Amino acid sequence: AIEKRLASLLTGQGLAFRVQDASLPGRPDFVVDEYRCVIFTHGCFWHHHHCYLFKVPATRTEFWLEKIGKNVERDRRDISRLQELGWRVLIVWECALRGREKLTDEALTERLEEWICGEGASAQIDTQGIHLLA
Ligand SMILES: [Zn+2]
């Protein structure tokens, strides 16, 4: 589900990028060839984030937890394969992009500028800032 916010923010920074790229593991939402980095915009429910957007469904609970667990394992392998290929990976969680605690365009823009152009190690952005992936 292509993120409007991010396409316009990346465009404003002067960067060229590909979107929803099926040629790379995980089909990353945005790919910036010039800086060897890819960006995923993950939903907090489907990818099992630890924030307030994560809610356990009251119906077929076990089924849902098993399914979302499998999504997480698949995400870990896609991220490892990308890194083995030489890509840096950023995950921007949904809680940073939409809803009550979302970042301002200014805060979000500054974190993107430093991470892309400063060649930061793989990381993830949430409502509390930027964190390494490992
Ligand atoms: Zn979240």
Dist CA 90 CA 30 (whole Å):
10
Q: Which of 21, 47, 48, 127 is catalytic?
A: 47
Dist CA 32 CA 15 (whole Å):
7
Element (H, E) at 92: strand 88-93
CATH number at residue 72: 3.40.960.10
29 is catalytic: yes
41 is catalytic: yes
Q: Can you say whether the dihedral through the CA atoms of 98, 129, 89, 109 is positive or negative?
A: positive
Rounded to the nearest whole angstrom, what is the distance from the C-alpha of residue 41 to the centroid of ligand 1? 11
Would you list which residues are annotated within the binding site for Mg(2+)? 29, 41
Question: Measuring CA to CA, how many Å separate 115 from each of 2, 57, 67?
Answer: 21, 35, 32
Please tell me the total number of residues recorded for the chain in this structure.
134
Rounded to the nearest whole angstrom, what is the distance from the C-alpha of residue 97 to the centroid of ligand 1? 9
Rounded to the nearest whole angstrom, what is the distance from the C-alpha of residue 83 to the centroid of ligand 1? 23
Experimental method: X-ray
50 is catalytic: no
Phi-psi region of 38 (alpha: psi -120 to 50; beta: other; left: phi over 0): beta
33 is catalytic: no
Quick count: other Cβ atoms within 10 Å of Cβ 87? Answer: 20
In the chain, the number of structural domains is: 1
Print the domain residue range for 17. Answer: 1-134
